[PDB]
Design a protein around this nucleic acid. Structure first.
Lengths: 82, 209, 101, 62
RNA sequence: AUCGAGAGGA
């Protein structure tokens, strides 16, 4: 599939948001570098929420189409609904 | 005893003309909506006495695309259709160069005739219809949405777009009443356009298996 | 096929009574009757006696597989209670699938 | 006779059964709660695949 | 600890 075109919705889903937040929170809790300036935050959930609001999440979503193909979306490339 | 029979025959004729028109065949307007008086003046008033005899209600109708492709409409005399009647009809289609026909039985089909219908399908194809299902036009019921046959090009286009196999699609049996009305075959796909209360219009695709 | 000890565990009493599983009891019955059949067929036995032995071995194996066979009586322990077959272990609710998976 | 003191019970990695390595039954045996078919049903409707895996595999019988 | 039964609560 050419990267120039994609058929999936440009909006992140609730399930995608939940799993991205959980995975990034686990990564942060396992001593990963942070992409935001932590004012005083010390808990991975709110750190990941701040990273999501900053659109600086180093995670790529592999949206598997039913036909067997997949489209790769960056978190920064998806509109956050909430 | 007689008015009932002529009314039944007129209604069957109207239903067959509508079925042929829906199948894409040359059906004239007057023959499409033929009234009781016109039917009487054209065929007769006393089917019991012989006017109209069931043999005279034969219909020759041609396809829109090719007059070289046309089908026969038959109303057999006997109540139960036998292998002899099937054979004489097959001989008639052989001499007249006809590949499609409709058998409008009065009561039912003999098992040998049904087996011959099954086995002889490739060269000559012909279908069997009880008289009772023909007294009403099924496609005009409110529960029956609009069914339209898809050409091979449209089926390929649909499959290409939805990136799915024919299997993935929902199915309609070959013995389904609407499938029998349209005279489709296993492997063809129909397009069902029905009103919806959540979107207005919905199109679903059914593959015959 | 003989299941391992995990499938049919030997429970431990509050003292030292090592009660065997019902599957283990059925297996012991199968082994004893199979040895009896082997010795009978190696020695001289009547046709009807061999047929009765075959019927009993059929019953034992079939009750190990499933102990709810129509007509034929259920396999009873030497206490007065019906046994539990491998089919009963995973039949409905409280069974293996619906109750542990 | 319904005194709450006889109804409260919590479990965190207690004894397990012998036939299957799943938590025991009954507060008297320090057994956990049953995450049954309807519970898995509601979690399916939720879409919480990781929570379903944690309940039925990770926290039950890894 | 296992089975079975009974009594119960929402």
């Amino acid at each position: 599939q050419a990267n120039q075109k994609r058929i999936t919705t440009p909006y992140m889903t609730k399930y995608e948001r939940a799993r991205v937040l959980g995975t990034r929170a686990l990564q942060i809790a396992m001593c990963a570098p942070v992409m935001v300036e932590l004012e005083g935050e010390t808990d991975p959930l709110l750190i990941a929420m701040k990273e999501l609001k900053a659109r600086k999440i180093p995670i790529i979503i592999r949206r598997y189409l039913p036909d067997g193909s997949y489209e790769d979306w960056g978190v920064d490339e998806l509109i956050i609904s909430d | 005893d007689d008015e009932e029979e002529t009314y039944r025959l007129w209604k069957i004729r109207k239903t067959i003309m509508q079925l042929c028109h829906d199948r894409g065949y040359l059906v004239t307007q007057d023959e499409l909506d033929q009234t009781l008086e016109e039917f009487k003046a054209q065929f007769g008033d006393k089917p019991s006495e012989g006017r109209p005899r069931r043999t005279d209600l034969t219909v020759l109708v041609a396809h829109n695309d090719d007059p070289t492709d046309q089908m026969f409409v038959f109303f057999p005399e006997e109540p139960k259709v036998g292998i002899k009647t099937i054979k004489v009809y097959c001989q008639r289609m052989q001499e007249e160069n006809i590949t499609r026909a409709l058998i409008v039985v009065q009561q039912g089909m003999t098992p040998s005739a049904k087996q011959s219908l099954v086995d002889m399908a490739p060269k000559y194809i012909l279908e069997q219809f009880l008289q009772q299902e023909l007294l009403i036009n099924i496609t005009e019921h409110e529960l029956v949405p609009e069914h339209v046959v898809m050409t091979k090009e449209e089926v390929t286009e649909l499959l290409a777009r939805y990136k799915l196999r024919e299997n993935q699609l929902p199915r309609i049996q070959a013995g389904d009443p609407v499938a029998r009305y349209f005279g489709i075959k296993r492997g063809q796909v129909v397009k069902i356009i029905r009103p919806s209360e959540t979107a207005g219009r919905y199109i679903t695709y059914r593959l015959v298996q | 096929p003989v299941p391992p000890l995990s499938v049919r565990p030997a429970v431990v009493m509050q003292g030292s009574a090592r009660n065997q599983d019902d599957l283990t009891h059925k297996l012991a019955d199968i082994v004893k009757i199979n040895n009896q059949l082997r010795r009978n067929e190696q020695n001289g036995a009547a046709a009807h006696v061999i047929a009765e032995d075959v019927k009993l071995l059929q019953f034992h194996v079939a009750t190990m597989v499933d102990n709810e066979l129509p007509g034929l009586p259920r396999a009873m322990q030497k206490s007065g209670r019906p046994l539990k077959s491998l089919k009963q272990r995973l039949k409905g609710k409280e069974g293996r699938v619906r109750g542990n998976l | 006779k319904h005194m709450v003191d006889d109804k409260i019970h919590s479990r965190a990695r207690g004894p397990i059964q012998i036939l299957n390595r799943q938590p025991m039954e009954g507060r008297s045996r320090d057994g956990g709660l049953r995450f049954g078919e309807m519970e898995r049903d509601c979690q399916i409707a939720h879409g919480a695949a990781q929570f379903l895996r944690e309940r039925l595999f990770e926290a039950s019988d890894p």
